[PDB]
Design a protein around this ligand. Structure first.
Ligand SMILES: Nc1ncnc2c1ncn2[C@@H]1O[C@H](COP(=O)(O)OP(=O)(O)OP(O)(O)=S)[C@@H](O)[C@H]1O
Ligand SMILES: Nc1ncnc2c1ncn2[C@@H]1O[C@H](COP(=O)(O)OP(=O)(O)OP(O)(O)=S)[C@@H](O)[C@H]1O
Ligand SMILES: Nc1ncnc2c1ncn2[C@@H]1O[C@H](COP(=O)(O)OP(=O)(O)OP(O)(O)=S)[C@@H](O)[C@H]1O
Ligand SMILES: Nc1ncnc2c1ncn2[C@@H]1O[C@H](COP(=O)(O)OP(=O)(O)O)[C@@H](O)[C@H]1O
Ligand SMILES: [Mg+2]
Ligand SMILES: [Mg+2]
Ligand SMILES: [Mg+2]
Lengths: 346, 328, 319, 437
DNA sequence: GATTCGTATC
DNA sequence: GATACGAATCTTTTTCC
């Protein structure tokens, strides 16, 4: 197993990076009966899902981690077959409605209204939680069913949905949930976690600075930092030195190369080459929102650009991110952003 | 049991003499009835202006007793696809008339909800069986009607109700319900109606419900605004004066205080300020462009929801900024 | 309640001599009537300019006493699927009927623009197999909706919009045959509000006669409404913003016109609008599209329309 | 008495308005499928309406089939509603009875009028049956000639399901990928008859109608009208019908011919480079929308404009113009298929390319957008990610979201498994393949 | 509609 | 011999039979 999963804290006492959030979770889990609906929001990779699973273990005891996966079939208006995977353990349910596209409304209706009405009497009645990963990916139609589903059937079901940047979450849903903020760990805590991992894994470490380098390069991403740690562990024969290169994902390198090309050569042919690169990126299912975000924040790291160019770049990035939110085809807005940048740089 | 109904479908006219406002349409359809010739009518206008009432009263006047078997009424609530038009409408307007004689009526309420295929099929039914059947097409949006369908129909336009028609209907309702109404309340009701009679009847029902003793107490403009939850004209004038003249902090404080005094919404204030400013004589012309564009953007954003304080401060800032061109 | 046919169907011409408008096309149709060698033809144009009447008059003048079983008039109101086409049309064309020497059966297909494509292919087979005994006459509003394989076999006749003189002449005929009192300006107003439509002109004249009697400008304009596309064009071409706003308010908002109707008419007017630069025209189209989106999402107030006019004036006034 | 295109049908292949190369390339093929043990099982002719496909097949089967008859044409009749037989079985019966035309019987098959292909069930049956003919294990079969008229289906009641036959009736949208790409299938696309052949043949029709033409004194004008007709259309039957209508008439009727549809790349070129004889951009775009609204009202057209706007002067124009074009396209993408969006986008593209167009420009070649390639790559990525997730539960209990798979686990997990592979799990290669440049 | 290449004709 | 012309290519994934 990966080091992200091998050393996942299985208890509320095993979480050792936020503490105050752990105290709040313990306050919530002291009396599970009056548990409200929760909304965990924070940067990607901080550990929100681990906190949800730790809270569930605190409430329902060990056994929430025995996940059974089954495929359940759906039917749309046009009568096509859709197969959603429902990672189901006892005492709780996991659903990723974003596995289907705009067709997640039928899931949020059928699958969730099925369990909301179905009680859990076995003379004693318990409430079974339901976890909704990536609550942002719901299409404002699943959320509209969600709000009344959880308002009226609160006696039998509890909703714990995880997300980052909960702005695309509608006001009725946000008003119906307890907002739990999960901040990202500081570099010291990431380095401490990596130190514990390497100690339990018998990796030879030259100096502790190469863990602070991993923490800084991951930008507060525990999973990303642990994956980097395992990568350089298995690419250096389990002996890491300060000469060991900081390794970054291929698409990040491609975006940085695209930034270099955009800054260097600014012509229509350069625009066409950038379009080819963007199409290659989209062929790897990298969402266009994060493509634009990484492109913007790599173009703002170039030192040859003055303040006027950077301000223009950030303004165009905001405009075209709003356009991308309301759009249907990503390539139009990505190409428009790149063209505007290449027209403003010169 | 007409006392067990909402005021809107309790004062629905039963005869053509009770349809106020549309003098010309009513006179022309009465002449059509008297002369014995009725063309294919098309009633078009805003909602709640007397289209369904007029057509039903006209059909009742033409067929006083045979109305059940002489008029086929269809609306958006009934499926009206290609098959319905082909079968039901054609078979109704293809058979001989009941009792002695006459012409059959086919009323299409809310015909803008029909697909283009249904209208294209309907056009030849209209042109082919016109000897013994006449059509009435009721529509709020004429752009959803095929140009051929508009061609083969006689167009009657229902204007929004004028002041006099609403005043007469209000007087009738007040006499019927033993209610009182101050002249200022009458003016407030006229302005909030915006050419709709359903709005007037609903507001009047809520005003009768608000009163503690609807047999002794009157209805003033205060009751009108309290029940309908709208800003008083004085509040709108005060907010606009604070925005235009006073500084930023006191303008923001005045806006918030006026809003919180009666729980007013920002969209109502926006519409009131726009109505007030439309009478303003601007001298830079770019003052109007900026006002209209910024306020339309703010209204759209409000319609999508969001931060109320941010939108209110945006309204104040948009007004003060636009009126900077006025002095230029 | 009584018996009186409306003037539109009471005065529908029965002979080709009573049809006004496209003189060359009607003369050609009369020639076809006399010689009798009618080709497959497609008739297209605006609504209410004498397309259906021309077809039916040609059929009558070509078949005479054999019209009863010589024409097969199928229309949009009738089912015209692939099976209906196959069975009915094939059986009608296979019907051996002795006709005069230079005569053929006629298959009138009114509203052929609303026919399914597979039915058009079956019509292709029937047209190319039984052409020696029967001929096809398509009546449509636009010839685009008829597939190219069918237009290949037909002689395309295009009916132009009726000129004011022809509609005036037909109106005068109907007036001097129904005995209505009129004024010259009244008939001019009827012509102006008809906008090249004979059916609309007849309907408006009958409505004015029934409602008020004498047909003058005042009665006509108090019963009929000036075409709102012209008002939209007047408001879009206004010099200053105040005049455009006033026109919009007092001529479309107080008159009870839907905001979606105003926006759609504005787009249609902008598409066909000379004396404006291409950049200005496309900017106006963009602003109209944005306002149309706002109307479609529910924000259909007068403020949105005023803002659209303000943006149009910004773009066209260098403001 | 009879239609001119019916009484003036060519009696020989020398009288047919076809190109010399086209006639040679159809004759050589037809001989190729005629010889026993022929490589080409069937022949597919495609093109516009009235491009003299059926006529050349008539004459070629008239002077070819007799050569190989041991000691004519057979056409399918979709109108044959035979008793006891469902409609979907009509073509089955026809093909089963028509395959008995090999020995002592020889007749080339011409499927001129196809069965109803707009119904999905019988269209699929047509595909399966013609594939069975193509993949037949029979020792030999009579040659199969199928003529397809490429026509655009105009808009109708808003219900479109096939997406292929519902926008264009062509060989690509009828026949599937397997059928067209087949070693034993031969396809010869046809082209509209050029103005030279039309002029010559209209002159022949006139010189065969001199008396009547001379009777109505129209022979002193026939040349200009013949040139006009030849320039207006590339349809021989429609040209002859229009000529007959003009000749038999006795007035000043305008000469009107059927309007031919505009292709995809034709519309793209008209938007980019403008149109000759129409210096008004407004009227050209207006006519483009009225006549070809089916083609212009699509996302594929905006994608084509985006993909091909760089072919103007081989990308040798200002970056400001390119930024304006892509900005307008992105704005149009935020209007959700409103007509104003397409109108504004096309108008802006045309205006931008008009303000920079001058003489001395050497443009490139347009291409179809590569979006379908990206969709196939994304589908392959989805399959690989599903496989990785499936492996990532039963091997070791762990649930990972798809976003994480696309971001980190599509690169770091294969890297770990490759390091584990070298110091030794099913999925060892990178998800979606490696990235380049 | 544009480019390129190849014909055919005058 | 010039030149206009012509051919190929530039394309893949509510209602009816
Ligand atoms: N001219 C009128 N005179 C009297 N009451 C009217 C008049 N117009 C509308 N009303 C009132 O408005 C009520 C509903 O209006 P209707 O005319 O039935 O609806 P409508 O005019 O068809 O508008 P739409 O298009 O159906 S929303 C009636 O029951 C009356 O009480
Ligand atoms: N040229 C004309 N001369 C005389 N009456 C005409 C003429 N054109 C139309 N009409 C009148 O219009 C009515 C019939 O018009 P139609 O020819 O049926 O309309 P249309 O041309 O078929 O348009 P569509 O597409 O069917 S709506 C009758 O009342 C005719 O008297
Ligand atoms: N000189 C000519 N050369 C060829 N065909 C001619 C000529 N003169 C008249 N025709 C006629 O033109 C018609 C052309 O038909 P074809 O193009 O062969 O069939 P088609 O290609 O299937 O047309 P569609 O698509 O079915 S409308 C035939 O009916 C010919 O008889
Ligand atoms: N307190 C902690 N101590 C050790 N590891 C942690 C802690 N919190 C999170 N992690 C690690 O972070 C990794 C990814 O976190 P995750 O829960 O996936 O974040 P998110 O909920 O944002 O997806 C997990 O594999 C887990 O092992
Ligand atoms: Mg109604
Ligand atoms: Mg007609
Ligand atoms: Mg043919």
């Amino acid at each position: 197993s990966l080091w992200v999963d091998k050393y996942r804290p299985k208890s509320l006492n095993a979480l050792s990076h936020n503490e105050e959030l752990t105290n709040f979770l313990k306050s919530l889990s002291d009396q599970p009966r009056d548990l409200p609906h929760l909304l965990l929001y924070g940067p990607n990779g901080t550990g929100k899902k681990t906190r949800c699973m730790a809270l569930l273990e605190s409430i329902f005891g060990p056994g929430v981690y025995r996940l059974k996966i089954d495929v359940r079939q759906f039917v749309t208006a046009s009568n096509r077959k859709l197969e959603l995977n429902v990672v189901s353990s006892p005492y709780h349910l996991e659903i990723t409605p974003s596995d289907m596209g705009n067709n997640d409304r039928i899931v949020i209706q059928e699958l969730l209204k099925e369990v909301a009405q179905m009680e859990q009497v076995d003379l004693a009645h318990r409430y079974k939680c339901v976890i909704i990963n990536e609550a942002n990916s719901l299409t404002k139609d699943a959320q509209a069913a969600l709000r009344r589903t959880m308002e009226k059937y609160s006696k039998n079901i509890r909703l714990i949905m995880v997300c980052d940047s909960m702005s695309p979450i509608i006001a009725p849903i946000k008003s119906r949930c307890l907002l739990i903020r999960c901040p990202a760990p500081s570099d010291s805590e990431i380095s401490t976690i990596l130190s514990d991992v390497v100690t339990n894994e018998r990796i030879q470490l030259e100096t502790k600075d190469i863990l602070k380098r991993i923490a800084q390069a991951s930008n507060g991403n525990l999973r990303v930092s642990l994956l980097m740690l395992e990568s350089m562990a298995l690419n250096n024969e389990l002996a890491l030195k300060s000469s060991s290169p900081i390794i970054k994902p291929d698409w990040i390198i491609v975006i940085h190369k695209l930034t270099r090309k955009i800054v260097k050569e600014r012509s229509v042919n350069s625009l066409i080459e950038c379009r080819a690169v963007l199409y290659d990126l989209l062929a790897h299912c990298i969402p266009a929102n994060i493509i634009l975000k990484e492109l913007t924040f790599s173009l703002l790291d170039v030192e040859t650009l003055n303040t006027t160019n950077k301000s223009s770049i950030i303004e165009y990035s905001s405009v075209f991110d709003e356009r991308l939110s309301l759009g249907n085809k990503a390539i139009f807005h990505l190409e428009g952003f790149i063209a505007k940048v290449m027209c403003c740089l010169d | 049991s007409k006392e067990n109904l909402p005021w809107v479908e309790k004062y629905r006219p039963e005869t053509l003499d009770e349809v106020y406002g549309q003098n010309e349409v009513i006179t022309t359809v009465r002449k059509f009835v008297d002369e014995g010739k009725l063309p294919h009518l098309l009633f078009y206008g805003p909602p709640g202006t007397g289209k369904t009432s007029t057509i039903v009263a006209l059909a009742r006047e033409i067929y006083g007793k045979n109305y059940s078997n002489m008029v086929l009424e269809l609306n958006a609530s009934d499926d009206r696809g290609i098959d319905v038009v082909r079968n039901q409408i054609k078979d109704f307007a293809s058979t001989r008339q009941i009792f002695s004689k006459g012409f059959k009526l086919i009323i299409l309420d809310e015909a803008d909800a029909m697909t283009n295929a249904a209208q294209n099929a309907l056009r030849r039914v209209i042109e082919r069986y016109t000897k013994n059947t006449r059509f009435c097409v009721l529509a709020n949006y004429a752009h959803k009607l095929t140009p051929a369908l508009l061609s083969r129909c006689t167009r009657f336009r229902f204007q929004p109700l004028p002041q006099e028609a609403i005043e007469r209907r209000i007087a009738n309702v007040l006499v019927h319900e033993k209610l009182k109404l101050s002249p200022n309340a009458e003016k407030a009701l006229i302005e909030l109606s915006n050419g709709d009679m359903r709005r007037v009847l609903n507001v009047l029902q809520s005003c009768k419900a608000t009163l503690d003793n609807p047999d002794e107490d009157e209805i003033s403009d205060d009751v009108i605004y309290e029940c309908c939850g709208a800003p008083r004209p004085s509040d709108l004038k005060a907010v606009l004066k604070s925005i235009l003249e006073d500084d930023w902090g006191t303008a923001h404080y005045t806006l918030n205080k006026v809003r919180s005094a009666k729980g007013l919404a920002l969209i109502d204030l926006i519409e009131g300020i726009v109505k007030i400013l439309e009478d303003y004589e601007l001298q830079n012309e770019e003052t109007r462009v900026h006002l209209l564009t910024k306020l339309a953007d703010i209204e759209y954003s409000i319609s999508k929801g969001g931060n109320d304080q941010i939108q209110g401060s945006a309204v104040i800032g948009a007004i003060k900024a636009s009126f900077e061109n006025e002095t230029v | 309640l009584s018996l009186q046919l409306p003037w539109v169907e009471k005065y529908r011409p029965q002979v080709l001599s009573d049809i006004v408008g496209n003189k060359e096309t009607i003369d050609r149709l009369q020639q076809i009537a006399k010689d009798g060698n009618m080709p497959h033809m497609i008739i297209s144009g605006m609504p209410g300019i004498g397309k259906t009447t021309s077809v039916h008059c040609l059929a009558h003048e070509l078949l005479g006493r054999s019209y009863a079983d010589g024409v097969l008039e199928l229309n949009a109101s009738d089912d015209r699927g692939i099976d209906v086409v196959r069975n009915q049309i094939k059986h009608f064309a296979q019907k051996k009927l002795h006709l005069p020497p230079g005569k053929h059966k006629i298959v009138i297909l009114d509203e052929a623009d609303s026919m399914t494509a597979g039915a058009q292919q079956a019509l292709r087979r029937t047209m190319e197999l039984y052409s020696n005994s029967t001929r096809f006459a398509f009546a449509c509003n636009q010839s685009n909706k008829i597939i190219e394989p069918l237009q290949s076999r037909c002689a395309i006749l295009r009916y132009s919009k009726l000129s004011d003189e022809d509609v005036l002449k037909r109106l005068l005929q109907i007036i001097k045959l129904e005995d209505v009192k009129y004024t010259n300006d009244g008939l001019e107003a009827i012509i102006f509000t008809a906008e090249g439509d004979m059916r609309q002109a007849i309907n408006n004249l009958q409505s004015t006669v029934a409602g008020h009697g004498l047909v003058n400008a005042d009665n006509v304009f108090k019963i009929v409404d000036s075409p709102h596309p012209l008002i939209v064009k007047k408001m879009l071409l206004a010099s200053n913003l105040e005049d455009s706003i006033q026109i919009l308010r007092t001529d479309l908002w107080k008159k009870g016109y839907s905001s979606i109707d105003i926006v759609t008419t504005s787009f249609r007017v902008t598409k066909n609008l000379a004396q404006v630069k291409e950049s200005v025209r496309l900017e106006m189209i963009k602003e109209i599209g944005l306002t149309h989106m706002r109307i479609l999402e529910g924000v259909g107030t007068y403020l949105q329309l005023a803002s659209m006019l303000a943006k149009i004036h910004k773009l066209n006034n260098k403001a | 008495g009879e239609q001119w295109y019916e009484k003036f049908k060519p009696n020989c292949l020398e009288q047919v308005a076809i190109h010399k190369r086209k006639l040679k390339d159809v004759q050589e093929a037809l001989d190729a499928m005629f010889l026993p043990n022929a490589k080409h099982r069937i022949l597919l002719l495609s093109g516009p309406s009235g491009c003299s496909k059926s006529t050349v097949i008539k004459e070629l089967s008239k002077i070819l089939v007799p050569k190989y008859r041991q000691n004519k044409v057979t056409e399918f009749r979709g109108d044959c509603i035979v008793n006891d037989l469902p409609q979907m079985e009509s073509f089955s019966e026809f093909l089963k009875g028509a395959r008995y035309l090999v020995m002592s019987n020889l007749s080339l098959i011409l499927i001129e009028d196809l069965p109803n292909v707009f119904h999905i069930d019988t269209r699929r049956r047509f595909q399966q049956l013609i594939l069975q003919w193509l993949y037949s294990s029979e020792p030999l079969l009579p040659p199969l000639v199928i003529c397809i008229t490429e026509c655009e289906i105009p808009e109708n009641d808003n219900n479109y399901r096939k997406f292929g036959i519902d926008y264009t009736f062509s060989a690509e949208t009828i026949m599937n990928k397997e059928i067209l790409m087949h070693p034993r299938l031969k396809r010869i696309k046809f082209n509209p008859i050029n103005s030279t052949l039309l002029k010559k043949h209209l002159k022949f029709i006139c010189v065969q109608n001199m008396k009547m033409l001379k009777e109505k004194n129209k022979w002193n004008k026939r040349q200009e009208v013949i040139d006009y007709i030849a320039q207006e259309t590339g349809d021989i039957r429609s040209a002859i019908t229009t000529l007959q209508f003009w000749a038999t008439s006795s007035g000043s009727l305008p000469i009107s011919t059927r309007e031919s549809t505009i292709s995809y790349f034709h519309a793209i070129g008209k938007v980019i480079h403008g149109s000759h004889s129409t210096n008004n951009d407004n009227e050209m775009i207006n006519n483009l929308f009225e006549n070809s609204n089916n083609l212009l009202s699509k996302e594929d057209f905006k994608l084509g404009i985006l993909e091909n706007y760089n072919t103007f002067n081989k990308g040798e124009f200002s970056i400001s113009d390119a930024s304006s074009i892509v900005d307008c396209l992105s704005e149009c993408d935020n209007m959700n298929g409103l007509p104003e969006s397409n109108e504004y986008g096309l108008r802006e593209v045309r205006k931008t390319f008009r303000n920079i167009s001058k003489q001395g420009h050497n443009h490139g070649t347009v291409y179809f957008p590569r979006e379908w390639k990206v969709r196939k790559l994304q589908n392959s990525f989805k399959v690989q990610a599903e496989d990785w997730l499936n492996v990532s539960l039963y091997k070791y209990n762990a649930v990972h979201s798809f976003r994480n798979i696309t971001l980190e686990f599509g690169y770091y997990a294969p890297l770990i498994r490759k390091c584990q592979s070298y110091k030794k799990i099913d999925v060892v290669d990178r998800i979606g393949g490696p990235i380049e440049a």
